[PDB]
Amino acid sequence: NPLFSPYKMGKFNLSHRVVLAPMTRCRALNNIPQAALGEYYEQRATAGGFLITEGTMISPTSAGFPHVPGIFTKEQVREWKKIVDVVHAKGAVIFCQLWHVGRASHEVYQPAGAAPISSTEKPISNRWRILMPDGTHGIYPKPRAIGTYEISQVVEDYRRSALNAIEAGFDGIEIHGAHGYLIDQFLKDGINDRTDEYGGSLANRCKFITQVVQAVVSAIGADRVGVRVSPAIDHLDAMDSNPLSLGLAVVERLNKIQLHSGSKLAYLHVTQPRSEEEEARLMRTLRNAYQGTFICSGGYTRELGIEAVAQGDADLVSYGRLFISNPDLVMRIKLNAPLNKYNRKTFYTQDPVVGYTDYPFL
Numbered sequence: 594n595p596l597f598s599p600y601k602m603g604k605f606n607l608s609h610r611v612v613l614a615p616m617t618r619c620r621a622l623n624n625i626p627q628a629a630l631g632e633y634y635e636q637r638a639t640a641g642g643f644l645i646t647e648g649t650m651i652s653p654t655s656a657g658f659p660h661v662p663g664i665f666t667k668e669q670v671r672e673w674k675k676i677v678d679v680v681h682a683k684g685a686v687i688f689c690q691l692w693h694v695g696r697a698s699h700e701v702y703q704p705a706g707a708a709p710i711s712s713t714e715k716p717i718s719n720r721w722r723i724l725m726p727d728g729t730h731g732i733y734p735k736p737r738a739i740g741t742y743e744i745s746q747v748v749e750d751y752r753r754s755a756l757n758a759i760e761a762g763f764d765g766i767e768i769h770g771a772h773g774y775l776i777d778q779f780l781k782d783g784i785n786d787r788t789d790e791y792g793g794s795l796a797n798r799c800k801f802i803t804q805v806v807q808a809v810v811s812a813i814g815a816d817r818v819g820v821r822v823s824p825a826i827d828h829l830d831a832m833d834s835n836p837l838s839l840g841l842a843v844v845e846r847l848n849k850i851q852l853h854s855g856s857k858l859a860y861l862h863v864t865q866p867r868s869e870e871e872e873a874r875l876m877r878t879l880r881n882a883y884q885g886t887f888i889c890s891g892g893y894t895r896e897l898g899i900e901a902v903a904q905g906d907a908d909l910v911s912y913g914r915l916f917i918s919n920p921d922l923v924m925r926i927k928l929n930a931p932l933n934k935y936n937r938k939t940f941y942t943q944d945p946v947v948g949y950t951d952y953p954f955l
């Protein structure tokens with residue numbers, strides 16, 4: 594089983610290649626990491642295993658889900674440290690995913706009920722609905738297109754949150770530039786209608802994610818910075834006319850950043866939608882073009898993950914919904930043991946146990 598051959602993820606010696614994909618669970622009440630988060634991540638941590646936390650707020654204006662943890666205040670850092678210490682006690686490497694939703698928010702989630710920010714004024718169409726704090730579904734409002742000065746301020750929010758995660762003991766951070774959120778709102782030409790230096794060409798649409806990466810790389814180091822993108826996923830009306838060209842453009846900037854910094858990034862993380870061969874060739878092209886560690890994600894199983902590593906399609910494989918319902922998913926993949934079903938009803942609920950930590954072990 595190649596999924597259990599060790600891998601050198603920079604200065605992090607990993608014992609296996611099963612990664613916990615970042616998953617918003619909405620158990621961090623009032624954006625404060627709770628003790629239930631420590632138990633949730635401890636159940637899934639393994640010796641030498643790699644975990645990526647749920648999307649974490651970088652600023653009071655970055656949330657678009659209820660009870661998502663933050664890392665922009667000191668109480669959040671203090672509460673995050675207790676969870677990191679528990680995860681590190683099991684011998685696992687843990688990265689904190691920095692998350693800004695952009696236009697994928699609502700007045701209820703914004704300070705003073707203000708409008709969400711984005712690269713544009715286009716709202717998410719009435720097809721997609723946002724989960725409300727009371728369990729209902731609301732309407733995505735019209736966002737506020739930000740100028741370049743506010744862009745540099747959001748970049749600073751990433752840089753401060755990256756340092757805060759290191760203060761909390763995190764081994765590194767992951768930039769969430771996928772799934773149609775703030776960074777993806779600057780990347781996809783189906784959203785980015787800007788006429789300034791941040792819109793138009795591939796280079797201008799890549800300027801935001803580039804500036805975000807260099808800021809956190811120069812703050813904490815390249816080997817502790819992961820990047821996640823999804824050029825072929827049209828979540829929240831985030832479509833591009835040429836996803837492969839967009840992905841190759843991002844890979845080109847990431848390679849240039851590693852050259853100027855004299856060090857390689859932690860990894861490149863790409864999620865794919867579920868033609869299978871065309872989607873596989875897209876993932877293979879991005880992997881071949883990026884000089885560094887590649888993590889594949891999106892509908893991966895035990896059989897599909899083994900072949901991804903065996904054929905050289907990826908260095909690490911991250912699992913999502915299967916890790917929700919299988920706390921010992923790494924052990925189940927090793928033994929080829931049957932997997933537990935997950936309940937989509939308790940994906941975003943607030944109970945610290947029900948649908949969170951009560952999924953049974955083997």
Ligand SMILES: Cc1cc2nc3c(=O)[nH]c(=O)nc-3n(C[C@H](O)[C@H](O)[C@H](O)COP(=O)(O)O)c2cc1C
Nearest residue numbers: 614615616617648864890891892893912913914940
């Ligand atoms: C409940 C839930 C929450 C998620 N939250 C996040 C998130 O916060 N950030 C992110 O980048 N991806 C998030 N995702 C996407 C997962 O990473 C996704 O499950 C993974 O990319 C591959 O899906 P699979 O392994 O379940 O097939 C989430 C997915 C689910 C189902």
